[model samples]
Target: ELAGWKDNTPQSLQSLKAPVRIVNLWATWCGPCRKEMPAMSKWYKAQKKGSVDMVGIALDTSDNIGNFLKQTPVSYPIWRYTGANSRNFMKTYGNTVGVLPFTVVEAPKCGYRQTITGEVNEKSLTDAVKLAHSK
Candidate 1:
């Protein structure tokens, strides 16, 4: 099911060098993650050029993720992040508790950065980008 999934690493992601990168860790079986999907999907589509970008990394079987995507598709790129040490993979992006729906906002050059351990809303998300721009 990884037929078209893009693989990423902590370094590879930062290399994208966007002004602000929102990286979210999720799984197909996570209800909370599913609950946040619609808003996340809308936010992904509403991103402006050169301002912010987002990525969703799934910690689940490729088949499950692929099948779910078929029904509730997302506009942003989704990566199937499964393999040995998969749980630890999320830690690389500051997921200390290894929770689904975890999100990290990174603006390396600026001082803007944060990690949300639970679900995020439009206001919290927008504030992160605004902070990044302000920096």
Candidate 2:
């Protein structure tokens, strides 16, 4: 059910450098993932022109992801992981299970960061930004 990053596409781990990256792993089949997708998108939109960066990695196949994108709008980049080695990709940031609607925060190297899993809304999401920035 998990796919590795193929074709050198962007992923949560890849965005972890330079600026703080918040990666949201989600799928169209996941109801909860769909629930908060918009909030995450809005949050990402609010973060534009700031130090924070957000990316969404959908575990769903490219076709589903594409259709989902057309239906639900997102402000940040969404990538599909399509390969065989997802363990290392998931393990890179504290044993990711390749689950839908998971989130991770990676601070700029040497800087402070936090990682989160599941659907996050306005307050919790914003709080992450504030908390990570305060460190």
Candidate 3:
């Protein structure tokens, strides 16, 4: 499976060096996560100009990921974290030991601008996208 993002691909989440970044934290069992997929998928497909990076981090296992993908296909590339990783991995991003479907939008030049721990709607996603463009 694709580990991270690639360059030039419409959905890949590379180091776009964009002004802002929107990180979506989700799990397979999360109802809100599944519910938000369609809108996010539509929003993702409409993204271009390389202004924002919507990095969807699915904090689920590989086996479950396949099922999730089958149920809710996304346009953005997926970042899987199934194996063991240092707690620092989340720490680097300022994540605490709580909240699922967490999201963070960081300004490449400055730093993190917004963070959320719940399922985000199109308005939130779109707002973050605009923020990223501002950055």
lDDT of 1 at 48: 81
- Order the candidates by TM-score, highest first: 1, 2, 3
Give the least accurate 10-residue stretch of model 2, judged by summed lDDT: 1-10
The lDDT leader among the candidates is 1
The lDDT, on a scale of 0 to 1, for candidate 2 is: 0.68
By summed lDDT, the worst window of 10 consecutive residues in model 1 runs over: 1-10
Q: What local lDDT score does residue 29 receive in model 2, on the 0 to 100 scale?
A: 94
What TM-score does candidate 2 get on C-alpha atoms? Answer: 0.78
In the order shown, the candidates' Cα RMSDs to the true structure are 3.4, 3.7, 4.3
24, model 1: CA deviation in Å? 0.4
Candidate 1 deviant stretches above 4 angstroms: 1-11
Candidate 3, 24-52: lDDT as tens digits: 76778988777877887788778775666
Model 2: how far is 113 from its true place, Å?
Answer: 4.0
Which residue pairs in candidate 3 have backbone atoms (N, alpha carbon, C) closer than 3 angstroms, thus clashing?
19-135
lDDT of 2 by residue, 1-135 (tens): 233323344344543443567777777899988988888888777764757877777766777787787899788777776657766666655546644567767666655656664449877788787777666
The residue pairs in collision within model 1 are none
**Compared to the true structure, candidate 3 yields what TM-score?**
0.76
Error of 1 at 126 (Å): 0.9
